[PDB]
Design a protein around this ligand. Structure first.
Ligand SMILES: CCCCCCCN(CCc1ccc(O[C@@](C)(CC)C(=O)O)cc1)c1nc2ccccc2o1
Lengths: 270, 270
């Protein structure tokens, strides 16, 4: 019945607003939008990034370039820190999906372990446009140009995400739609090592029904939007696979030194 | 009008029967036996592999294969030849999809290049069960275990296709369903390099509707079958990307390993 489906949609949306600080609606107004107040600090150059680190809420290290902690690495570590934050926000959101907490504990951990990356890039699109990505609670904006100019390894890091985001954003989904979509992704069922796939697929089935009805009500003039969004999942998985692959090529660019432990314990391969 | 969509479905199913010699219906009839007319010869070891060129027909070597073209490499060449044959059938089928031949020629090439293997693995599932796969137009059956026991690298070319097949076949789709799905796969707007995306998506939207209706009518008791089939599109990309990486390994450890120009061309990019 559409009564449970609309209730599930409202519930997920409310939970999504609570768990995620920067919503797409919020970020959109900032990116390609007006709101002639509090504009983002634009990191487009090596010098603009430097000054950015001393004029924006930053909690990692101090801006100094002299054979000691280069820019590229300081940027890489930055996305890692925010990433660990996002993982906790997503984990909290997960526990609000009806039935999730009732699944075998190992399966909850398994579903989060393999779904968080797919979700991170999905929500990252909300903060991106063909020219750049919002940073620091939307208080900043790092251009695509700058990111794509970093060292050989770090240069083609964000590019594939910009390509995915461009295509993903062409769907013009909003937070109410995305809230359901993210839930579908978490309740996959084909993650390796799952112990009890049945309830997971049962929940996702219910979530898909909700997503479909949501898209039909929210985008009545958008033919087969349900189908198009789902096929976008093939590109996501590829983005992720590709990304973890680069992470290995990077892993061989920082390892030794008895310094930075514990901090390296927190991050790891996430 | 849902009427136009049913007409489209019949058209595509019709072209599918005419383009593919071995349908899933024929495949399951051979596999589920209960027949005396089309029982296959089973290849499960070197010995039975030998007897094979005696009951069926294999343009290779029946007797010893060590000092005379290896068995693994020999079986690989067979799949190779079958593949370019499958590429031709699929291409012939592609031409029957309304609007396809009217698209910019270059885009026709792009859609085929990126779509063929996803279709090859979808259709290959039709010829598989948990224990093996049909070969030689269904006259033979080669064991999953035999395949996995081939030389170091060759021993794992098929396992991921089998793992996918068992999960895909649980959907219990029939040729009338597959025919539309295969068309949806070809008409993908997110293929790299497309010039005119819009016309391609207008056609796919039409195919997505026909597929959605077809599944509702053909699988009344199957909840969200449409969504579940579309998600499978993710497993397909992974199979392709993985197959590609294994091919590059073989190319290097087997300097005498030849590949057909057609397959090498479609793999030239990705
Ligand atoms: C959609 C039109 C009909 C398609 C029928 C596909 C039959 N087939 C597909 C599996 C396959 C395995 C290996 C393949 O690798 C190559 C390098 C060809 C050796 C390729 O084409 O990229 C390609 C394809 C396949 N057939 C067989 C027979 C015996 C063992 C394995 C095997 O795999």
């Amino acid at each position: 019945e559409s009564a449970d489906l609309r209730a599930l949609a409202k519930h997920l949306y409310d939970s999504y607003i609570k768990s995620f600080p920067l919503t797409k609606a919020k970020a959109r107004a900032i990116l390609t939008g007006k709101t002639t107040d509090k504009s983002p600090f634009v990191i487009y150059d090596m010098n603009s990034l430097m000054m950015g680190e001393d004029k924006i809420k930053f909690k990692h290290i101090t801006p100094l370039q002299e054979q000691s902690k280069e820019v590229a690495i300081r940027i890489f570590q930055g996305c890692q820190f925010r990433s660990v934050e996002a993982v906790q926000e997503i984990t909290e959101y997960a526990k609000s999906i009806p039935g999730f907490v009732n699944l075998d504990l190992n399966d909850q951990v398994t579903l989060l372990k393999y779904g968080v990356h797919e979700i991170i890039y999905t929500m990252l699109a909300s903060l991106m446009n063909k020219d750049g990505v919002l940073i620091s609670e939307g208080q900043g904006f790092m251009t695509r140009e700058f990111l794509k100019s970093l060292r050989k390894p770090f240069g083609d890091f964000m590019e594939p995400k910009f390509e995915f985001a461009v295509k993903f954003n062409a769907l013009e989904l909003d937070d109410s739609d995305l809230a359901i979509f993210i839930a579908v992704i978490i309740l996959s069922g084909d993650r390796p090592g799952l112990l009890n796939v049945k309830p997971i697929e049962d929940i996702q089935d219910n979530l898909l029904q909700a997503l479909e009805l949501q898209l039909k009500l929210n985008h009545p003039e958008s033919s087969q939007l349900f189908a198009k969004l789902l096929q976008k999942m093939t590109d996501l998985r590829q983005i992720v696979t590709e990304h973890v692959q680069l992470l290995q090529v990077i892993k061989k660019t920082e390892t030794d030194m008895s310094l930075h432990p514990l901090l390296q314990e927190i991050y790891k391969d996430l």
